[PDB]
Each structure stands twice: as C-alpha cells, then as structure tokens.
Amino acid sequence: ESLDSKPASAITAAKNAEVLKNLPFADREEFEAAKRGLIAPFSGQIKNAEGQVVWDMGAYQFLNDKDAADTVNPSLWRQAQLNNIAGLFEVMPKLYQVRGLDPANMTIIEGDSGLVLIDTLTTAETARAALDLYFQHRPKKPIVAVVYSHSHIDHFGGARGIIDEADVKAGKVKVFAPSGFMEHAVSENILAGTAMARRGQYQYGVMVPRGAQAQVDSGLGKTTATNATNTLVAPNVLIEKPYERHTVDGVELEFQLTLGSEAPSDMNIYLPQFKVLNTADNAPPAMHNLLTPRGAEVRDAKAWAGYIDASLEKYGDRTDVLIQQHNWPVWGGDKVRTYLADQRDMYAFLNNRALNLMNKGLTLHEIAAEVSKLPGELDRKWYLRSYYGALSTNLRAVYQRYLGFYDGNPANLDPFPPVEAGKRYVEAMGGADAVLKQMRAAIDKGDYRWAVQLGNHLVFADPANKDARALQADAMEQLGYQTENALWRNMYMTGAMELRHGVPTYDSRGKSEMGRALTPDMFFDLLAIRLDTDKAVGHDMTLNWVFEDLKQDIALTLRNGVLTQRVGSLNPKADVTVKLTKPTLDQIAARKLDLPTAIKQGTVKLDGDGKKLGEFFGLLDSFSPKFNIVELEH
Amino acid sequence: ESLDSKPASAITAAKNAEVLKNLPFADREEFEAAKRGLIAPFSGQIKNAEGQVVWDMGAYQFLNDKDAADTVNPSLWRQAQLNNIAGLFEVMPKLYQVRGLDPANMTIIEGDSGLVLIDTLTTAETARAALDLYFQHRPKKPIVAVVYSHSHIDHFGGARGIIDEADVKAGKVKVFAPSGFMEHAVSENILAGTAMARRGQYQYGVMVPRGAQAQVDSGLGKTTATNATNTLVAPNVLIEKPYERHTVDGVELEFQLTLGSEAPSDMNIYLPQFKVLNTADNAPPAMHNLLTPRGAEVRDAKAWAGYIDASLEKYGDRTDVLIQQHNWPVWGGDKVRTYLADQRDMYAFLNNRALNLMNKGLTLHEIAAEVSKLPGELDRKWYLRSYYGALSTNLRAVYQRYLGFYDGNPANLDPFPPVEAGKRYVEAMGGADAVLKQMRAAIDKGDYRWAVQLGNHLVFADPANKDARALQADAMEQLGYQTENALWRNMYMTGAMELRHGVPTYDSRGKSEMGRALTPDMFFDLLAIRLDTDKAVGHDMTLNWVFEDLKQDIALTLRNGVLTQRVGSLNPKADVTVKLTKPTLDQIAARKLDLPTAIKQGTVKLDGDGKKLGEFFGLLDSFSPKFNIVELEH
Ligand SMILES: [Zn+2]
Ligand SMILES: [Zn+2]
Ligand SMILES: [Zn+2]
Ligand SMILES: [Zn+2]
C-alpha cells in the first residue's frame, strides 16, 4: 500500500467535470473587480530576520492562466486564481489597499500630516512588507491612527511591527477597536490558544505543499504566514456606542459596532468623504464561518444578518464602492446594495431555516443533509459560495448555538471516546481485515465519505495498522480533490499528510509576542489552565501579588487543586506575598528570568513562605502545540 | 421479545449495592436543612381549570421513609427523598419560601404594606397554588413587586396567574429583571421553543410514570408541571449595572448581575435587613448543567465561578443563611462560606481542567473519559454530586463553548444523518440479525452503554424491527437504573418508553400564553422561522406595518424565501401597508381572528396589494410538538 499523493480517481475527476456544467458562465465579472485599481502587483517572497520564508505568492504560479486540474473542483480553482491577484491597489485617491501579502488586507488612508490605517495584518513581518510596498509608490508619512476592525489575529497581529508600544500607552498614536476587544482577543487566541493554533494548521493547510494535488487556497486568502511573529498591542480608544463618528488627522470615521457576528468584538467602518463602506470581515465574497475550523465560540447568524441589514439601510445609498479586509472590493452603488442584501439573506437563512427544522424535530446532521443549497437566486451568486464556511457546518453551528452538541437522543448522551469506540466498531464488523476489505470496497465504489468513517475507527483502534492509514489518507485526499470548500480541502489534505508522514515539527505560536499585552489578571487566568490539578491537590495555598508599578493587587488561591484569583484585594493570612513589577513578571513569564536570580537582584520581594512560590510554579503544565489529530495521542 | 419494564439485572443491582459503601455516611445533615423552617407540609395535588392534575407530590410516596430499590442508584434515591420535603417554609420572620409545588421555588418577602416576590414558578396554576398555601398561614396582602431572578421559564412562567399585565404596564407593580431578560427568554422559550419543549419532555420524564422502575426525581426538583399554563409578563425595571440597590415597599434589595452564568439573563439577590443571600440558580445543592438537555445556549463556567467568588467576597461575611430558587437553604455563615467556596472551585475546575486537556490535544469525549471525578474534597460533598448537571456533559460543554462540536479530525467533518449512518453500520456489521446477536451479547455482558449505540443504528435503519426496539429499551432502562443523574435517568426512561409504546400525545406548550408578551418585532422574528423557504421562494414581496397604538413601524421584506425585518422605518415601495394595533395582531396570531373578518371590521387597513397579505400568511409552517426522538421522524 502506497503513501504517495495519488491522482484523481475515475469518480473524482468525473464529479469535477460535472461541476464545469453547473457553474454559471457569468465569469470575468469578478475578475474585473479583482484587477481594477491595481498599481504594483506582487508575486514574490517575504522573509523574517533569520531568512525563513513567511509568505510566498510565487508558489501558486500553477493556478494562473490555466484551466482546472481533476484534482481540484473548478469552482474552488476559480476562487483560488482570484486570490492570486495580489499587490498594491488604489480604490480612490488617498485610499489604498494592500492585498495578497497576508491572508488579510490592509487599508491605508493618506491623512493630513500622517497616515490612518485599517488593520495591522497577521504578522509584524507581513505588515512591514505591506507598508514597504506602499511607500514605494506613495510618499512617506508617519502613522497617526490605526483601526482594529475586530478581535482577530489576522488584523491585530502585525501591530508592534508598524507602530510603537509606548506611543499608544502615552496617547501620541490613537488606536480604535470594538467594545470588549481585549477580553475576547486574549480568550480565543490565548486561553484556548494551543488548541486553536494547532487546529489552525489544518484550517489553512500550513505544512501542506502548494500544488494541484495539495494546497491551493484558503477562500478568504491563500493560507497564513509561517515562521513569523504574532504581536498584540492593546487599543487606547474603545468604541462602546452602537454608532460613533470620530475624526483624526483630517479624516472622518463612521463606526458600526457589529458585536457578536464575525467576531465577538467586531465593527464596520464608513468613510463619508470617499463614499466608501468597509465591512471588515462581515460580508466577504464567500460564505463565512459561523463556527471556525481552528475552534472558537459560535457566532450569531441572526445578529450577523441584522448588522448587514443595518449597513444596507444606514449606508446603502451613500456608497459607490464596498471594500473588505479580505478579497477584492465591489464597484457601483447598485451592485453593493444587491451584494449586501444577498449577504444579509444568507446569514438570515442559515439561522431561520435551521431554527425552522429544529422545531420540526431534525437533528444537526439531518439539517445539514436536508439543506443542500441556498434558496432561490442566492444559489447562483459567486460571492455566496461555500468557499470558506460550509453551508453544512454553518447549519450544524446554528443547532450548536441554540441547542448544543447533544441531539436529544439518549443513545448519544454519553459517547465513547474515539479509541474505545474505534476498537468496538472494528470488532463489530469482523476485525481489521474485514473493515479493510469494506474500506477498499468503498474506495472502489467511490464512497470516500464512508471510507473515512470506517478508516477512522480502525486507525484509532490500531494506529500501527499501516494499511489503514494509507487507505484512510487516500480517501481523505480524494475528498479534498472533490470539495469546493478551500478550508475543507486544507483539512482533508493535512489529514492525509499526517496519516501518511506523521505530525511535522512546527509551532504556530513560536515567535509570538502576544504575552506582552497580557495584564496580570489575564496571566493568572492562563496559569489556572496551566495548573495540574492532580499534582496540585494536597498543596493548598494562598498567594498575594502586589504590582508596585501598576498599583495592582491580586490574591491567588489554590484550593482542592483548583486555582482561583481575586483582582483588587489581598488575603491577610496569605502564605507568601510577591512584590514585583509588570516587566519583571514579563521576563519570568517568557522564561528569561530565573527564579533564584530574581530574588537576589531585588526585583522580586517576598513575605512569608518563599518555598511556596517555587512549589506553586512546579505545579504548572506546558502545552505541546504539536498534538495528534487524525490518530490518537500523543 | 417482551416490552414490559424489566427488573434490575444481577450486574445492575450489584453496581447499585456498591454505591451504598462508597457514598459518604454524613447523611441527615442535608435532611435537617431541608426540614428546617417547615410550617405547612404539602403532598397534595394541584389541578388546572379542566380538573386535570398538574402537580402531584403524593405520586412519590414510595420514596418516603423507605430504603433504595435495586432499580435506583442509592445516591439519587437520597436526592429524591430530599426533594419530597415540600411545603411552606419560614426562613426568618418576614421571609418565606414555597418549595416542592413546582420544579422551582417561590420566595416571599413581607413588606411594609404588601408582598415582595422572587420568582413566580413555572405555570399560573402552580404559582396560584403557592400563594394559596402562603395565605393559609400568613395575612392576605397584595403583591407590590416581583423579581425575575433569571430568564428561565420555571421562574417567570407563573407571573400572569398572580400579577396583572396592565398593572406592570402602568408601573403600579414594579417587576425587576436582569439585563436583557426579554431578549433571552423569548429566544430560549419561544424562538427555539417547540424543540426545547419536546426535548424537555425527556429532561424531566414528564410522561413517565412515577415509581422505582421509572420516574423518581429531577435533581433540583421532581419534574415539571403537566397540562398547565405557561405565561410571560415583561418586567418594568431592568438591572443593568453590575450591582444595584433598590428599596421597594420598605425592603432593601441588592442585585448582583451574573449574566452568562446559569442563564444568559441572570442575577443574585442580597437582603441586608435579613443577612440572607438568594443565589437563585447559581449555586444549587448539586452540580448544574453548563449545557441543558432540553437545549439552550452554552454556559460560561469561568464567569459562573467568578460570580460565585464575588458573592462569597461581597456577601459571605454578612450572610447568616443562603437561600436558593431550587432546593433547600444552607444555614450558618461558616457553612455558607464553605458552600460557596466549594461551588466556585467546582465551576472553576470544570472550565480549567477541560481547557488544560484541550490544549493538551484531547477531544470532547476523551476529556469526558479522562476526568471521572471532582478533585480533592470536592468529591466528598453531597451538594456537588452530578444529580442535575453531569460531569461528562459539562466537560463536553466546555469543549463546545471554546471549540465547538467539531473535534478537528476531518473524518468527523461531514457526518451522516442518523438514518443514513444507521443503515450503513448495520450492513457493515452483517445486518439486523447479526447486530441483534451483538446486542444480546452486550446486554448479557452488562454493556448497556454499547448496546444502545448498536441498537440506535438498527432502530434507525428499520424502525419496524420490534426486537431492536425492545432490546434497545431494556438496555436504556438498565442505564437508567444505574445512573446517579436524575436528568439522565429521566432521559433513559422516556426513551425506553417511547421505544416501547411510542410518543404519547401531549403538548407541553398547549395552554401557553407566552405570545402575549411578544412585541411586534419579536412576533416577526418568529414568523421568519415559521416561514417555509422552499414555498416562499418566488413570492418575493415587501410589507409595511404600522402600529397605531404602539406608534411603531416595521418594514418586513421577503426576498429569496428569507424573511428579514426593519424596525423604525417603512419602505416607500412596499407591495402593501398594514395599519393595525397590537391587540388586533394577537387575535390573528392566537388564531382567534380570521383575516377577511378583520378587514371588514375596520381594525385592519390595507394599502396596496391586498392579495399579498393573504399569500404571505399561507407561507408559514406550523410546528408539531410531538416529534420522534428515539427513532427517525414520522
Ligand atoms: Zn475576522
Ligand atoms: Zn480576517
Ligand atoms: Zn434556572
Ligand atoms: Zn430554575
């Protein structure tokens, strides 16, 4: 049995051929929108300080000006080509977008004395790349204001690389965000972060080769940046009212809090002077995720559609062009009004149809099966295709949000873990060789869907079964070939790759400098997750922390192996008090500063049982960002 | 194959005998707390207008002063025995509680001139019955104020039976609520209502007969009311700040907002005069659900633990007795502080341990299997047992909250619907007879857990297979006999019953009057759900609605078979304009008033396409509330 990337099968290639028939020949239209406004194209490479490639558009050369392979769905192929159109873009004078040098875009407005920015890109390396391309056709000006459209890494991540941390702590540089920015940014990207990062490797297929048999696109971009630095710098102006007009450096900004939609903290941005609406990530030219593959809190389709409807109302007529922080803009008032209404109708449908079926008694997989397409004319639009988010996932995601993972059927109340259930299903079907045969029968029958369900149990029951991995991976690869959904493809490809070759060595949050923005309370929130309950039981203790610089007081309490904290108080009878400053912690947190060293320097002062601090730090786990996904631990 | 309720199996009874030894012997402590303050006991019946029974405590007589049967887990039997302690209780002079006439409790505070209430129970009938019992021992006074402690039907559903709609509308009776009450109460109980009510039939085993081989208790109560009226009356004063003091009828009320925890809209109530804390449903004497079986939004254990630690800090030192809106109070400051400390550690642990393992790479069923108990002394407390919420469910609920239903493994990206998967697995195992063989072997082995997974496949493949159904029911029954979890037992019993004798004809929301509180926007949010998209595809149209009494305008738009709405505006080019009143709408809504009848009456003015209004109402589906759960749909 082979561990090589197989070609498209008879059945795969045919399925893809059929798609050519079913796709509407209203082509070129969108291509015209992709290309319009282009100044300096980019098809090169971006490197970090050590010389490693962080972004590389050149690897996608194969998509360009060619027809679709059988190893790719034609619809996705098209979308993949569109995201290939990258570089520097003029919308209107004084208004620029840098596309295809990050999964995200960067919108820069040429202010009076300086510059106003919308979004910082994913990484400090891409951000400075973006600006570098800008300054190369436009005059050099400093940065007066930055706009975080949402609490998403691909937008706040490139921050520290283009703006100084202290100009924001002082106020010389104003930074605009949505309400509850910091609390949600740190949850998604830090508190469940190790899981999120690793699952994310599947979402964008980051370690998967770029080719027609492998990695082609990520729907709203190509993929993400590799071996680069995730930064985080907290905002100084928190927009908390539903609408707000602010003015800075001679630019008028109309903000629309779209909280709870695409991000838990998210806002749109309108520019009166230009007659332009920035929907951020709220209306991309592809169905978005209500539940992201990397893992996040479910999003609200209902609120999502209302916010789009609000945009359509409040700015629908006074807009000539709509620009987003992902993909190309849409030109002409008529077209934006139609676009937004279709976008609204989409998310509204997801919510309403799912809720319709729920009250009809359908369970999440039933619903996903029963709704095969968007209703009416929404089906025929290129910008509502399941390229990023899946109609199916999204329908399940509504059931999740309103009712949960449990389907109501007591037979699904307490499912067996994958290893347990695998072993039992294999036995039930006659053992390894019996299922292997059934797998082959299904791969020949071109039922790759069932083959993976079959193979999954087997690989989990016996991960040493080399013929099971090879088969499972082939079945997945085929599913990746057939799928319209750029994200699904990435996941099926990364699946196959890791079934075959194991888990590659790479940390998504290796270079990360996001722990700088962490307040002490967010830090101890992290330590609570880090703490090993089982070891910690028996070692009950209380710890006082006084942050002399921030004049902050936190009371940590470890009881029954559970860690809890009180911000703004101190326990009198605490076992130890730790007097220090934010930066001192910062270096203990990034492992720069040795425990016994710190006490000698005078940088950490102790009152009580010092051996308690040491023993408390001993009780912390560290998380490997390199865990198994398609086979069992470790 | 038999369809009768089977007795305990040798392994089941054995398992249940072992519980006796491992349960802590410090019984009686909890009984003394439940009995304390009892004035008037209740074991009676409560009946509706048509004389049907809505609530019967005497049905549980079998539990009283008797030892546990082999068909019920001893720990649960204890819990059941405590929930049998029902009636009117004095907490302190001027402070009374009505327990065990409803799944929830009623707190009654005697004021300067009238009565201050906390929660109104589930139904008009029970609520009236609670006040009867009170007035039978305390002086008849009017209700001056009501407090909705959270947006759960067991706390707001009985309001209309005891206070007047227009009195609240005017401001004579102050009704307090936590921020966003209406929004979340109408969402959970009306928008997703038919699903939630039916799934709720399982959660409380409503149609399951009460006895040792069937229904016995529901953790924080016995069950819910049957054949009763759910009401809803919108509050007039909303608590928006984290803490608020209010004095009404000479009663000092401190509110602590605890939004996101047990309920989206939720708060605690401190009574400084008394030195008592009402923790509503935030600290019941049992683990609570982070994800409820009936179905609702996931709950935030992190917040949950945080709010408790807040109560502990801000009220723990000035609290002599803690009272709850379910179960008995806890007496003694030292005891309440221990109690709240333990409860906080619990929800903190749930969140933190799950998140720990998540970052370690474990999936939801893996973490469920890995964590078998609460840590340290938390395991040893009666008030933290999984009687209501399950430890496994809650662990899975943390996974759901932060990551979602998808485990990251692409094999599980696109699962088959129950029927599809069932037919395939059955085939893969060698068809009905072969799987029935395997089922039989599993029941003999005492593997009731595996049996139900096996049988579910079969029953869904062919719901006419009476052996399958009968076996699956027996296995479900044993699982029910074994479980400590009141909710799970209910679910397993209801399932076994419906597998055997089908779904009985009962509407939980039969007498419901919750549509009366619905404002027009709410009513249209409901219609968009009710709308049949396939049908309404092709009938695109626009409707203006003007509410003469409310002075409110609503712009309905139906596009691509999807219904959206705009509040505060009218579209000038609408196919029709309707000018009416809220009462008028209600009567058409409750089906009491025909369409053409109303038009004639002058209560409904049309402006445009008259035919259109008719063709719009004929596009809405009706939900049957009797859908199958343990087998595929009708
Ligand atoms: Zn985003
Ligand atoms: Zn983005
Ligand atoms: Zn509740
Ligand atoms: Zn309750």
Side-chain angles (χ1 to χ4, degrees):
Chain A
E1 216 72 76
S2 191
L3 269 63
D4 308 304
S5 185
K6 321 287 192 282
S9 78
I11 312 84
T12 297
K15 201 193 180 80
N16 286 324
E18 274 289 323
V19 178
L20 284 145
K21 297 200 174 192
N22 291 29
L23 56 98
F25 284 77
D27 310 350
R28 297 255 75 83
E29 250 260 359
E30 285 260 282
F31 284 104
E32 281 165 58
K35 288 157 178 171
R36 193 162 143 177
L38 181 55
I39 307 141
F42 172 81
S43 172
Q45 284 204 323
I46 311 159
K47 285 173 198 169
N48 66 3
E50 22 257 57
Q52 299 176 291
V53 178
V54 166
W55 187 259
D56 170 24
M57 270 299 312
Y60 300 91
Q61 185 65 56
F62 67 92
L63 293 159
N64 292 317
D65 303 303
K66 254 79 84 287
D67 283 320
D70 353 323
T71 62
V72 182
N73 182 293
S75 183
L76 177 64
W77 186 269
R78 183 193 191 261
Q79 185 84 8
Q81 291 179 310
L82 276 163
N83 300 318
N84 274 3
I85 305 157
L88 186 66
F89 296 85
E90 182 178 46
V91 187
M92 278 163 177
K94 268 153 87 201
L95 187 69
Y96 301 103
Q97 271 190 325
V98 193
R99 320 212 310 256
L101 277 72
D102 196 273
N105 302 347
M106 189 179 270
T107 303
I108 306 141
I109 312 143
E110 308 180 308
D112 292 37
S113 61
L115 291 176
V116 181
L117 254 64
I118 314 165
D119 289 356
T120 63
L121 305 186
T122 325
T123 56
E125 282 101 343
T126 43
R128 205 197 287 97
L131 262 65
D132 268 39
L133 172 57
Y134 171 84
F135 286 142
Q136 272 171 226
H137 284 78
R138 291 310 297 182
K140 193 172 169 70
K141 297 191 171 210
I143 305 165
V144 201
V146 160
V147 180
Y148 302 168
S149 59
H150 50 293
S151 62
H152 279 172
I153 202 157
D154 60 308
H155 304 271
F156 70 81
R160 288 182 86 260
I162 40 164
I163 56 99
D164 199 284
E165 204 177 323
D167 288 312
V168 195
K169 210 117 76 194
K172 185 195 179 172
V173 177
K174 280 277 190 293
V175 192
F176 307 117
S179 176
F181 174 85
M182 274 307 290
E183 183 204 323
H184 291 110
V186 304
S187 174
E188 203 188 78
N189 308 274
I190 301 134
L191 286 187
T194 312
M196 192 278 267
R198 171 81 175 108
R199 288 172 67 108
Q201 279 172 30
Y202 275 60
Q203 192 183 307
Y204 308 104
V206 297
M207 295 298 292
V208 169
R210 331 295 183 191
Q213 281 190 296
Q215 211 287 309
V216 305
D217 195 57
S218 296
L220 298 202
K222 291 326 286 179
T223 186
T224 45
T226 57
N227 314 113
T229 325
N230 298 280
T231 66
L232 213 158
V233 40
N236 50 41
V237 172
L238 283 156
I239 278 84
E240 280 142 40
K241 273 197 174 163
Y243 293 73
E244 287 179 39
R245 258 156 284 224
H246 291 252
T247 39
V248 53
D249 198 46
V251 199
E252 294 170 337
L253 260 45
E254 208 155 333
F255 297 113
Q256 180 188 350
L257 278 199
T258 51
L259 302 196
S261 64
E262 189 265 335
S265 168
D266 171 54
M267 72 186 171
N268 279 343
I269 303 94
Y270 181 75
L271 311 182
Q273 308 136 293
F274 300 95
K275 288 179 78 184
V276 183
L277 178 66
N278 196 303
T279 40
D281 286 14
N282 299 346
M287 176 185 287
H288 210 314
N289 283 304
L290 287 179
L291 177 76
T292 172
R294 66 203 162 75
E297 291 171 44
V298 265
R299 302 154 170 172
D300 182 6
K302 197 190 192 75
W304 204 325
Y307 287 121
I308 292 167
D309 207 16
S311 297
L312 182 53
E313 202 173 12
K314 210 139 189 295
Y315 319 92
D317 316 325
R318 47 179 174 167
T319 30
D320 294 291
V321 54
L322 176 145
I323 67 168
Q324 313 108 113
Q325 296 303 89
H326 284 276
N327 317 89
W328 46 95
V330 44
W331 272 273
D334 289 295
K335 281 179 176 184
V336 313
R337 279 178 292 272
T338 296
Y339 181 91
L340 293 181
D342 289 312
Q343 292 276 346
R344 174 203 66 218
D345 284 345
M346 187 170 56
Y347 297 102
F349 175 66
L350 290 166
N351 201 83
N352 297 358
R353 188 78 176 108
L355 237 9
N356 173 278
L357 294 169
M358 275 173 252
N359 292 302
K360 278 189 182 178
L362 280 84
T363 66
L364 64 161
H365 307 305
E366 279 166 44
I367 292 161
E370 259 260 326
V371 179
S372 54
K373 64 163 206 67
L374 288 175
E377 289 303 298
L378 304 168
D379 187 34
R380 320 226 189 116
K381 310 268 184 190
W382 283 101
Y383 54 87
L384 310 186
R385 304 304 293 167
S386 298
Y387 287 129
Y388 199 67
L391 169 67
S392 66
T393 304
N394 282 354
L395 289 164
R396 295 190 265 249
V398 186
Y399 188 106
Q400 178 177 307
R401 201 186 97 94
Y402 286 90
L403 298 177
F405 82 86
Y406 173 53
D407 86 336
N409 184 346
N412 305 124
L413 193 44
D414 193 13
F416 282 100
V419 189
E420 261 291 294
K423 287 182 168 189
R424 285 165 184 268
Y425 272 118
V426 175
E427 177 170 319
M429 292 174 210
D433 307 2
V435 308
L436 278 164
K437 190 184 190 186
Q438 287 191 56
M439 257 189 280
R440 289 195 185 89
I443 54 106
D444 306 345
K445 216 180 62 186
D447 192 337
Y448 307 93
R449 204 162 148 191
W450 181 250
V452 300
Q453 218 137 318
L454 231 48
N456 196 44
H457 295 302
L458 187 49
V459 171
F460 273 85
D462 178 28
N465 186 322
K466 55 210 172 52
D467 287 336
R469 309 175 66 105
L471 253 48
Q472 169 91 333
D474 289 3
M476 272 199 195
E477 188 164 54
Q478 295 301 301
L479 280 168
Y481 294 161
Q482 300 179 18
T483 195
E484 184 169 357
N485 187 283
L487 258 38
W488 283 31
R489 178 181 182 103
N490 295 322
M491 313 188 93
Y492 288 134
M493 293 321 159
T494 314
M497 191 194 76
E498 294 184 0
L499 276 148
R500 290 165 181 157
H501 318 282
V503 179
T505 331
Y506 169 61
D507 193 350
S508 291
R509 308 291 136 102
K511 280 174 155 279
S512 182
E513 291 174 14
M514 286 188 296
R516 285 220 202 264
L518 252 52
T519 64
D521 68 290
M522 293 160 177
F523 175 68
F524 291 119
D525 275 340
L526 216 189
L527 294 207
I529 301 160
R530 284 184 53 194
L531 171 87
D532 195 289
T533 293
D534 308 271
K535 302 166 165 187
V537 167
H539 304 260
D540 288 16
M541 68 176 78
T542 29
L543 284 85
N544 274 356
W545 300 77
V546 48
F547 290 92
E548 299 163 316
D549 61 338
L550 284 162
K551 296 285 261 296
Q552 206 166 309
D553 302 303
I554 103 96
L556 270 191
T557 139
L558 180 68
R559 196 167 104 88
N560 293 307
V562 187
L563 184 81
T564 45
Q565 66 172 310
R566 278 170 187 185
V567 189
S569 53
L570 298 166
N571 180 252
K573 298 197 169 178
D575 298 0
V576 65
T577 303
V578 194
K579 301 201 159 157
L580 45 59
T581 66
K582 192 191 170 160
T584 318
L585 215 217
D586 270 324
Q587 273 133 113
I588 305 161
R591 291 207 160 190
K592 263 94 167 166
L593 228 172
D594 186 27
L595 209 134
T597 309
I599 321 155
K600 282 185 177 171
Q601 296 169 16
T603 41
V604 170
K605 296 179 190 69
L606 292 93
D607 290 290
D609 202 341
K611 266 204 168 178
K612 244 79 189 184
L613 186 70
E615 70 170 288
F616 161 90
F617 276 95
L619 299 167
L620 275 28
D621 283 341
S622 279
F623 312 110
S624 157
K626 219 67 268 207
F627 61 82
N628 290 339
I629 289 174
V630 294
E631 60 171 316
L632 36 157
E633 258 70 303
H634 308 100
Chain B
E1 205 78 61
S2 180
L3 257 63
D4 300 302
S5 185
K6 312 300 186 293
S9 70
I11 134 174
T12 291
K15 200 171 258 47
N16 279 334
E18 272 289 307
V19 175
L20 250 346
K21 302 172 171 278
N22 284 37
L23 65 87
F25 278 89
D27 321 6
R28 296 265 84 97
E29 265 269 338
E30 290 251 278
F31 289 101
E32 285 159 42
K35 285 169 200 155
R36 179 141 154 204
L38 177 67
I39 298 162
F42 174 85
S43 292
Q45 284 196 353
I46 299 168
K47 288 170 182 182
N48 62 348
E50 298 94 296
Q52 311 171 277
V53 187
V54 311
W55 186 262
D56 183 18
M57 265 303 308
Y60 300 96
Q61 193 76 53
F62 66 96
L63 294 162
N64 293 318
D65 304 284
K66 256 77 108 292
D67 273 327
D70 40 26
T71 51
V72 43
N73 180 290
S75 179
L76 172 63
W77 187 273
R78 189 182 193 264
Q79 195 59 8
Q81 276 186 318
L82 284 157
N83 280 330
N84 274 10
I85 300 163
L88 169 64
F89 297 71
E90 177 181 57
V91 181
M92 279 168 77
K94 278 164 101 186
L95 182 63
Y96 301 88
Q97 267 184 325
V98 185
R99 308 210 320 248
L101 276 73
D102 186 89
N105 298 346
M106 182 180 284
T107 298
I108 292 149
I109 318 152
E110 296 179 330
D112 284 17
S113 65
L115 293 176
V116 184
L117 257 67
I118 303 160
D119 299 332
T120 70
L121 308 178
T122 319
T123 62
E125 292 90 330
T126 44
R128 214 184 271 110
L131 250 68
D132 284 24
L133 189 63
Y134 170 75
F135 289 146
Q136 277 182 234
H137 292 74
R138 289 303 309 176
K140 183 163 145 71
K141 294 197 174 175
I143 300 158
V144 190
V146 174
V147 183
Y148 292 155
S149 63
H150 58 281
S151 56
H152 285 162
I153 209 168
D154 52 318
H155 305 263
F156 70 68
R160 250 187 66 94
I162 57 162
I163 50 101
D164 196 82
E165 189 178 319
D167 270 313
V168 181
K169 214 100 68 181
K172 187 165 216 168
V173 176
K174 293 286 165 83
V175 179
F176 296 92
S179 174
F181 178 96
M182 277 309 296
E183 194 187 325
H184 295 108
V186 298
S187 184
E188 188 176 295
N189 310 273
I190 287 147
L191 297 199
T194 316
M196 190 279 269
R198 168 78 172 119
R199 284 174 54 114
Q201 291 182 11
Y202 272 65
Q203 183 181 321
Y204 302 95
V206 292
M207 297 298 293
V208 183
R210 327 301 188 194
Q213 286 185 288
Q215 215 280 321
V216 299
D217 191 56
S218 302
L220 307 182
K222 300 313 285 187
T223 176
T224 36
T226 47
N227 311 123
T229 296
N230 295 300
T231 69
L232 214 181
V233 17
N236 51 45
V237 44
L238 289 138
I239 284 84
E240 301 289 319
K241 287 189 275 204
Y243 298 82
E244 274 179 37
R245 261 157 281 214
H246 290 251
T247 33
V248 81
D249 203 53
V251 202
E252 290 170 354
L253 273 50
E254 207 165 318
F255 300 97
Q256 178 206 347
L257 276 186
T258 60
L259 323 167
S261 81
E262 187 254 350
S265 194
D266 176 49
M267 54 191 188
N268 291 327
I269 301 107
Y270 184 64
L271 308 171
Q273 294 148 308
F274 298 83
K275 293 173 99 202
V276 305
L277 177 72
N278 197 312
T279 43
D281 288 14
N282 306 338
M287 188 190 280
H288 207 323
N289 281 307
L290 308 176
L291 179 89
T292 170
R294 69 195 160 91
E297 293 180 35
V298 249
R299 294 165 183 162
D300 180 14
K302 198 179 165 57
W304 204 321
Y307 298 130
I308 292 172
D309 198 22
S311 293
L312 177 58
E313 184 181 18
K314 203 155 190 284
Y315 308 127
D317 294 332
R318 45 173 183 178
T319 292
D320 293 308
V321 23
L322 189 134
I323 57 161
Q324 284 139 103
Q325 289 310 112
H326 283 276
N327 311 91
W328 42 102
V330 30
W331 314 86
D334 302 287
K335 275 186 161 157
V336 308
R337 285 180 286 275
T338 295
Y339 190 81
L340 298 168
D342 285 317
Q343 291 265 350
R344 160 208 74 195
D345 289 342
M346 188 172 61
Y347 297 104
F349 168 70
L350 292 160
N351 196 82
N352 293 339
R353 188 76 181 107
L355 241 10
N356 177 282
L357 298 165
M358 256 174 257
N359 288 319
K360 277 175 183 163
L362 283 77
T363 71
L364 63 164
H365 305 305
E366 284 163 54
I367 68 180
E370 262 280 298
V371 184
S372 57
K373 53 170 278 281
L374 297 176
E377 289 315 292
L378 297 183
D379 193 54
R380 312 205 215 285
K381 316 275 181 160
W382 278 114
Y383 54 89
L384 314 167
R385 310 302 298 180
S386 307
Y387 289 133
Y388 207 69
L391 174 64
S392 54
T393 294
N394 285 359
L395 288 162
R396 295 187 262 243
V398 190
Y399 196 99
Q400 181 187 306
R401 190 184 107 91
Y402 288 93
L403 295 178
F405 82 93
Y406 177 59
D407 75 336
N409 187 345
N412 292 142
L413 193 44
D414 192 32
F416 284 101
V419 288
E420 265 291 282
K423 283 180 177 192
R424 286 167 181 268
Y425 273 116
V426 174
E427 203 174 295
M429 288 170 207
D433 297 2
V435 306
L436 286 149
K437 204 179 162 202
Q438 288 196 45
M439 262 194 262
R440 275 189 193 104
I443 303 164
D444 292 330
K445 225 183 84 195
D447 206 333
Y448 304 113
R449 205 182 163 197
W450 179 244
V452 305
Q453 275 225 51
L454 228 46
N456 196 58
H457 291 314
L458 188 45
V459 174
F460 273 77
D462 171 33
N465 190 326
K466 287 222 103 82
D467 281 337
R469 295 175 74 103
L471 256 51
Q472 167 95 350
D474 283 355
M476 266 199 202
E477 202 170 62
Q478 293 306 312
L479 284 178
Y481 291 157
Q482 288 181 17
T483 181
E484 192 180 1
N485 189 284
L487 262 30
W488 285 34
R489 183 185 175 103
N490 290 332
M491 294 185 262
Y492 287 138
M493 299 317 175
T494 313
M497 186 185 79
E498 292 184 7
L499 270 150
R500 278 160 183 175
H501 312 297
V503 33
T505 321
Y506 171 77
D507 184 351
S508 293
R509 246 54 117 176
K511 287 168 143 275
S512 179
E513 287 180 10
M514 284 179 301
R516 289 159 92 101
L518 264 38
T519 77
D521 27 87
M522 287 158 194
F523 178 86
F524 289 116
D525 280 333
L526 212 184
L527 288 195
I529 293 155
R530 277 182 66 209
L531 177 91
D532 187 301
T533 306
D534 313 272
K535 289 185 189 176
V537 156
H539 306 251
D540 301 0
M541 68 180 68
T542 32
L543 284 80
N544 286 352
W545 291 74
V546 42
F547 286 83
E548 291 162 337
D549 56 334
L550 305 153
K551 287 178 192 71
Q552 216 193 307
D553 300 292
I554 292 98
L556 276 189
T557 132
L558 174 68
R559 198 170 98 85
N560 291 300
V562 171
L563 189 67
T564 56
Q565 79 164 298
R566 277 178 186 170
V567 198
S569 71
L570 303 144
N571 160 246
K573 302 193 169 186
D575 308 26
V576 67
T577 305
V578 193
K579 321 194 162 171
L580 44 64
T581 48
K582 198 193 187 193
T584 310
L585 224 210
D586 284 337
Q587 254 142 117
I588 309 149
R591 289 180 159 202
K592 264 83 178 185
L593 226 170
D594 180 42
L595 187 142
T597 309
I599 303 169
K600 281 190 163 181
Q601 290 177 54
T603 54
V604 172
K605 304 180 194 295
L606 282 92
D607 284 295
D609 205 321
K611 272 217 163 187
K612 228 79 179 199
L613 178 74
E615 73 167 287
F616 166 78
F617 282 138
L619 288 167
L620 302 152
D621 297 326
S622 261
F623 304 127
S624 182
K626 218 170 91 87
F627 57 71
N628 302 333
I629 276 163
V630 282
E631 63 180 316
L632 44 156
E633 320 272 55
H634 225 259

